[PDB]
CSV table of C-alpha atoms and ligand atoms in Angstrom, one decimal:
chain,number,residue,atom,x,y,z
A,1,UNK,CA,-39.6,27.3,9.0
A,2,UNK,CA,-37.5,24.4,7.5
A,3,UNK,CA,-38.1,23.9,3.9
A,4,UNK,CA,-36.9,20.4,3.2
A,5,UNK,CA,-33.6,22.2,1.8
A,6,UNK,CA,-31.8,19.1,3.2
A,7,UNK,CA,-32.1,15.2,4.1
A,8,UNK,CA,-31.6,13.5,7.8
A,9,UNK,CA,-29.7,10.6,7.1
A,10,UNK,CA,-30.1,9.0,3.9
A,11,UNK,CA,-33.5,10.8,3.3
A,12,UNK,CA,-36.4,7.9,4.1
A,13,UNK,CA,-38.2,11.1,5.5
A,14,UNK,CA,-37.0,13.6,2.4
A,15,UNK,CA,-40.0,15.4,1.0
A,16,UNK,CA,-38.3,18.2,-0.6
A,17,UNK,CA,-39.2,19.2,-4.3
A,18,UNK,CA,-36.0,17.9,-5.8
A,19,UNK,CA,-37.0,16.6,-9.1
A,20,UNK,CA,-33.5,16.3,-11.0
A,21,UNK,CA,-30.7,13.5,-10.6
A,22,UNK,CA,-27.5,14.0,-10.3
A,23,UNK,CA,-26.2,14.3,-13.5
A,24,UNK,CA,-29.2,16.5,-14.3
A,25,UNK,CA,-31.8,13.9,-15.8
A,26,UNK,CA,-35.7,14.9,-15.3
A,27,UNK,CA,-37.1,12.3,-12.9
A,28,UNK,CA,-39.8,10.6,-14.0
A,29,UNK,CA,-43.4,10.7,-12.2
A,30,UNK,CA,-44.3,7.9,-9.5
A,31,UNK,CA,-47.7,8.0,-10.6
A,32,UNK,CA,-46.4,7.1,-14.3
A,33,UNK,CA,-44.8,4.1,-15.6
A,34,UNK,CA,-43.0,4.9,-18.9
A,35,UNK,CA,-40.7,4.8,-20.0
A,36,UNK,CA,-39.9,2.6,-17.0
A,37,UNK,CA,-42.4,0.3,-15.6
A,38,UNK,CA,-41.9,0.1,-11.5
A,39,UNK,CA,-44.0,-0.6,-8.3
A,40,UNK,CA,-43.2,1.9,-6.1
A,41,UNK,CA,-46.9,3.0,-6.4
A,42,UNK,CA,-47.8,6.2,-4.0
A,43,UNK,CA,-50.6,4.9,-3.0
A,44,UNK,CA,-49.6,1.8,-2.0
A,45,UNK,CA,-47.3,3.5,0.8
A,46,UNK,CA,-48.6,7.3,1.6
A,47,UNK,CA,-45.9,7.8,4.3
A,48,UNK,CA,-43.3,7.5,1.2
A,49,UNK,CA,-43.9,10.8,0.4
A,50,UNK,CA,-43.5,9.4,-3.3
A,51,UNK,CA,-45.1,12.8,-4.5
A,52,UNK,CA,-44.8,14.2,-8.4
A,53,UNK,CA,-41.4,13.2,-9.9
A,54,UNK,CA,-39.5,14.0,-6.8
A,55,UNK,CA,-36.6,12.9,-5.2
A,56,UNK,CA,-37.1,10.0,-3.2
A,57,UNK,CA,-35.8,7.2,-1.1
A,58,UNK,CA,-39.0,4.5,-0.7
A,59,UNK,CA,-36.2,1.3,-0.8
A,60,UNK,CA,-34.3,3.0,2.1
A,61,UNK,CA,-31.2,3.3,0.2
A,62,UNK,CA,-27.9,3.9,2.2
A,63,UNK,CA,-26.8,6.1,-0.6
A,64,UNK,CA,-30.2,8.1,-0.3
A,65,UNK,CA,-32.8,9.4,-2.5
A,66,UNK,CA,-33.3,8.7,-6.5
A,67,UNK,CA,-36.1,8.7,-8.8
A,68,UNK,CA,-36.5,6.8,-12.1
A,69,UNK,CA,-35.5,9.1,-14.7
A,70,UNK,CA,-37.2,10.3,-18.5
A,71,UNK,CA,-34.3,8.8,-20.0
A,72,UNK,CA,-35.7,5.6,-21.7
A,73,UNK,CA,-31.9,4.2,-21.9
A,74,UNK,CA,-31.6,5.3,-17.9
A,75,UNK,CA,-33.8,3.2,-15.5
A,76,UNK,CA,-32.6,5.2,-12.3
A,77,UNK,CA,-30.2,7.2,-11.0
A,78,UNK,CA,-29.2,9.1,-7.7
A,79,UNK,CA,-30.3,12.3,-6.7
A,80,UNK,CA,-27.7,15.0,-5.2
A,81,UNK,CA,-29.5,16.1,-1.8
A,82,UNK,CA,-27.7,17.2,0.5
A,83,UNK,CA,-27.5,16.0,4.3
A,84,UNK,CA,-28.6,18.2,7.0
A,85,UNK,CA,-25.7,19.1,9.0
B,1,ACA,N1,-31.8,1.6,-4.9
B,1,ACA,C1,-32.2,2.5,-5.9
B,1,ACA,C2,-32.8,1.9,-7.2
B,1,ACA,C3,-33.9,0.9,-6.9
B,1,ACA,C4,-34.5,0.5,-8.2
B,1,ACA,C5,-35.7,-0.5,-8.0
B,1,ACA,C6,-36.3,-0.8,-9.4
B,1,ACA,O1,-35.6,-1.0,-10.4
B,1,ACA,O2,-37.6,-0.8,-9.5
């Protein structure tokens, strides 16, 4: 069964386990806000999927998902999912 290997689009339904960004940075947890302080708060919008530190694309970004990263100098950055052919 599909795995969430790949995005539709640019990924507002994503909710693969992508954690990384594209130049390799750990994303940083939704449910945590250091070292970058943010409101894109799981629980205010479930059907985000904004799950662990994954991938994610909650401000419906045409250039698809990102996460905040663990690099304190870093606020965000892009992840590298790839589109569902
Ligand atoms: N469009 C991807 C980055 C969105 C970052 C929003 C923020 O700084 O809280």
């Amino acid at each position: 069964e599909f795995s969430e290997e790949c995005m539709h689009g640019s990924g507002e339904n994503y909710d693969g386990k992508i954690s990384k960004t594209m130049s390799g940075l750990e994303c940083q947890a939704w449910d945590s806000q250091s070292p970058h302080a943010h409101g894109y708060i799981p629980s205010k919008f479930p059907n985000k999927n904004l799950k662990k530190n994954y991938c994610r694309n909650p401000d419906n970004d045409p250039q698809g998902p990102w996460c905040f990263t663990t690099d304190p100098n870093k606020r965000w950055e892009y992840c590298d999912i790839p589109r569902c052919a």
